C-alpha cells in the first residue's frame, strides 16, 4: 500500500543526506577512469562544489565555476590551501576529508 520505485528511493535517500550530513549528490556515472560524483556540501555558511572519483584511490576536484566572486573571497579565507587543489588520497581517509570540509566551511571569517 506504499510502493516506492527504485527511482523514488534515490530521491528519498538523497533528500535524507542533505539534511543529515550537508551533502548533496546531483549526478553519478561510471566511465573507464572510475566512478564519479557531482557534489555540493555545506550549509548557509559555506557551500563547496566538487567532484569525487574512485579508482582504492580517491580523486577530489574542487569546482569553482558556480561560486560568486564574493563567495570565493569568503571561501579563500575559509578553506585551507590544499582544499583548492586537485587531490588524490586513499579511501580510508575520505571521512576525514568530509570532516575537514565541514569544519572549514563553518569557520567564521
Amino acid at each position: 500500500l506504499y510502493f516506492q520505485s527504485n527511482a523514488e528511493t534515490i530521491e528519498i535517500i538523497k533528500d535524507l543526506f542533505e539534511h543529515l550530513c550537508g551533502v548533496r549528490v546531483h549526478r553519478t556515472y561510471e566511465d573507464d577512469t572510475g566512478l564519479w560524483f557531482d557534489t555540493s556540501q555545506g550549509s548557509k555558511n559555506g557551500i563547496m562544489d566538487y567532484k569525487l572519483g574512485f579508482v582504492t584511490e580517491v580523486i577530489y576536484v574542487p569546482l569553482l565555476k558556480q561560486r560568486t566572486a564574493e563567495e570565493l573571497q569568503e571561501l579563500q579565507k575559509k578553506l585551507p590551501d590544499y582544499l583548492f587543489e586537485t587531490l588524490s588520497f586513499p579511501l580510508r581517509s575520505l571521512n576525514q576529508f568530509y570532516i575537514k570540509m565541514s569544519k572549514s566551511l563553518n569557520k567564521k571569517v
Binding site: 546531483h26 556515472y29 566511465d31 573507464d32 577512469t33 572510475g34 564519479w36 555540493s40 555545506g42 550549509s43 548557509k44 555558511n45 559555506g46 557551500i47 562544489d49 567532484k51 572519483g53 579508482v55 580523486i59 577530489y60 576536484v61 558556480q66 564574493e70 563567495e71 569568503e74 590544499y82 587543489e85 586537485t86 587531490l87 588524490s88 588520497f89 586513499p90 581517509s93 576525514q96 576529508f97 570532516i99 575537514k100
Partner: peptide
C-alpha cells in the same frame, strides 16, 4: 555572508576526468 543553495556523460567530461587524475597531488592524511 550566507551562500545561496543551488537548484538540482559527455566526451568533455570524460576527458576532463583524465586530466584531473594526472593533475592530482597525492596526499595520505588530513
Amino acid at each position: 555572508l550566507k551562500f545561496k543553495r543551488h537548484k538540482n556523460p559527455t566526451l568533455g567530461e570524460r576527458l576532463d576526468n583524465l586530466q584531473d587524475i594526472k593533475k592530482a597531488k597525492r596526499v595520505e592524511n588530513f
